[PDB]
């Protein structure tokens, strides 16, 4: 079931609840040297998706690392590390507060799209004189 409108600070638009990215490993490598068998990318992803789901459930109100610690753990240390990490990356606890505005209007508006000088791809505002017709066209 889905019952909320979830936004994220766009630059984060590299994260995918399905997969992992070179970003986080360079920020949390301690699950990837394959040295500590009790840790693995897999349990990492488990924790990850679990927590993000939790937050996305009722994101209007905050979510603590202590919460997850109560819920599931294999460690406090790494748990906190990654939790605060995602916090930084706003994937979690980002919409804890709401802010609004009346937004008065100005001459530029999103529904304004007219004919005017253009920086984009080519366009020809002057077509052809008379003698151009003088060609054995295709």
């Amino acid at each position: 079931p889905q019952a909320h409108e979830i936004v994220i600070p766009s630059y984060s638009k590299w994260f995918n609840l399905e997969k992992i990215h070179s970003i986080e490993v360079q920020s949390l490598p301690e699950f990837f040297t394959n040295r500590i068998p009790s840790k693995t990318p897999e349990v990492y992803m488990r924790y990850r998706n679990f927590m993000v789901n939790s937050y996305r459930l009722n994101p209007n109100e905050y979510f603590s690392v202590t919460t997850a610690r109560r819920n599931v753990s294999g460690d406090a240390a790494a748990l906190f590390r990654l939790h605060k990490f995602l916090t930084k990356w706003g994937l979690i606890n980002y919409q804890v507060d709401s802010k609004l505005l009346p937004k008065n209007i100005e001459p530029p508006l999103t529904s304004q799209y007219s004919t005017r000088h253009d920086a984009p791809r080519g366009l020809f505002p002057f077509e052809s004189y008379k003698p151009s017709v003088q060609l054995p066209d295709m």
Binding site: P9, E30, R35, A76, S98, K99
Partner: protein
């Protein structure tokens, strides 16, 4: 145009500078991890630590009755910072002097300073599946409104078996949702430790039988499967009750 950098944010203001307006309340920490973390935890990892926390007694006014784990092999966190984060997570009055954190970290390091992980049973000895001496682990917990008690063999001599598996397995009850399993393993790692810890005070961490209280506190050979009213301690029960704790 739009307004978003920090929680639906504001990007349309009087054109000022604002450092990291991210706090739920005092919530921004990422500073100073990169180099230290990389250089530190690129090497082997080792034992963990169960920890209990009690501060509600009539010497101080709290709800501190929680448990959690820890890696003594870690040196990455100012423990006090972690504590304060936990406390603010407990929504307590920001005045952390009347909410004294020093006492808490004192208790913490106190508890950590009596640990060796598993003995040479792991440090130098390696017995396939351990050797013997499955303790009749007794675990009761009080979650939400219900308590649950159980007793069962669980080896102390073996390392090959970790707790959390038992946790996720006994999760297959009604729901045993989340919050439960943790404490179990914690208690588990608690329960076991002291024993060999106490046994560490002696010297059997290599050999067999010990020296006096280890005699009653053991399982036996058990050449044949048991009766119904003895193991009738192993089963489990879920009971509602008015709390008096």
């Amino acid at each position: 145009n739009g307004y978003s950098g920090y929680g639906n944010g504001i990007t349309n203001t009087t054109t000022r500078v604002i450092p990291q307006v991210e706090v739920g309340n005092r919530k921004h920490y990422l500073e100073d991890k990169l180099k230290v973390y990389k250089q530190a935890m690129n090497e082997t990892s080792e034992q963990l630590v169960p920890i209990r926390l009690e501060f509600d007694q009539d010497r101080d006014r709290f709800f501190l009755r929680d448990t959690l784990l820890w890696n003594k092999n870690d040196k990455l966190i100012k423990i006090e910072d972690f504590v304060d984060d936990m406390l603010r997570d407990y929504r307590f009055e920001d005045a952390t002097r009347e909410q004294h954190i020093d006492t808490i970290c004192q208790s913490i390091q106190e508890q950590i300073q009596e640990f060796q992980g598993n003995p040479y049973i792991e440090l130098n000895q390696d017995r396939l599946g351990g050797d013997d001496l499955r303790i009749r682990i007794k675990l009761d917990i009080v979650v939400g409104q219900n308590q649950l008690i159980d007793q069962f063999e669980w080896d102390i001599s073996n390392s090959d078996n970790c707790p959390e598996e038992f946790a996720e397995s006994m999760c297959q009850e009604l729901e045993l949702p989340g919050e439960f399993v943790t404490a179990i393993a914690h208690s588990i790692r608690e329960q076991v430790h002291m024993y060999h810890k106490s046994l560490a005070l002696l010297g059997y961490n290599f050999d067999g039988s010990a020296r006096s209280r280890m005699l009653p506190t053991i399982t036996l050979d058990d050449v044949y499967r048991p009766a119904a009213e003895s193991k009738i301690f192993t089963p489990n029960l879920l009971q509602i009750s008015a709390a008096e704790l």
